[PDB]
Amino acid sequence: MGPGFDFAQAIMKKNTVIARTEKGEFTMLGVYDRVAVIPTHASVGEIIYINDVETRVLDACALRDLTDTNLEITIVKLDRNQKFRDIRHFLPRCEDDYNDAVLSVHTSKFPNMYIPVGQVTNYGFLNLGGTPTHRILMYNFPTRAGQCGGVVTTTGKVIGIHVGGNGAQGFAAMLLHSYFTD
Ligand SMILES: CCS(=O)(=O)N1CCC(C(=O)O)CC1
Numbered sequence: 001m002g003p004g005f006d007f008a009q010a011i012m013k014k015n016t017v018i019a020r021t022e023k024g025e026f027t028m029l030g031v032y033d034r035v036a037v038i039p040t041h042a043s044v045g046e047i048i049y050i051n052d053v054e055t056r057v058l059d060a061c062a063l064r065d066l067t068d069t070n071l072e073i074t075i076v077k078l079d080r081n082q083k084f085r086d087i088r089h090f091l092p093r094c095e096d097d098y099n100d101a102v103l104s105v106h107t108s109k110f111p112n113m114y115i116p117v118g119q120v121t122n123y124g125f126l127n128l129g130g131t132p133t134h135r136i137l138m139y140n141f142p143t144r145a146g147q148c149g150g151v152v153t154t155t156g157k158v159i160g161i162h163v164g165g166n167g168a169q170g171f172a173a174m175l176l177h178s179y180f181t182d
Pocket residue numbers: 003004005006007008010011155156
């Protein structure tokens with residue numbers, strides 16, 4: 001509808017796949033080469049389905065901060081025959097607050113879904129499903145089951161992936177440039 005939705009669509013159309021684990025179907029963001037991200041509660045194993053194709057997992061790392069606190073991000077390297085467009089230059093370098101974000105989802109249940117979530121707070125600590133979690137972003141939208149893995153963008157920046165909600169607020173794990181150096 002406007003330039004926020006423009007940037008979100010550009011990310012969805014080239015840098016997302018549908019990931020399926022034994023815990024469900026997730027929006028999955030491809031970042032560069034064969035490297036993608038998914039919420040850690042997806043419980044990625046040795047095999048994952050990517051757009052309904054059986055795919056070997058070459059590596060999966062559940063990220064934690066240097067206090068050994070959950071970040072709710074798993075970085076997955078896929079045995080895929082095709083690379084992602086490199087979008088690492090759209091990742092923030094530091095923790096921050098944002099205005100006018102969009103949450104974008106693409107699954108069998110919710111194809112081509114875009115939600116203007118408005119202002120995003122650097123919330124920090126969250127007890128997420130009983131697990132102490134850091135680097136949480138919060139937005140005042142009543143997000144629902146089916147949206148985990150959704151991509152949070154502003155114009156020009158990919159800032160997080162949706163990991164949970166409390167019925168009135170939604171929560172995303174931050175993406176930082178430093179997670180994807182090589
Ligand atoms: C109003 C422009 S924008 O922020 O939506 N956007 C800039 C270039 C983006 C890209 O390189 O993919 C997609 C479009």
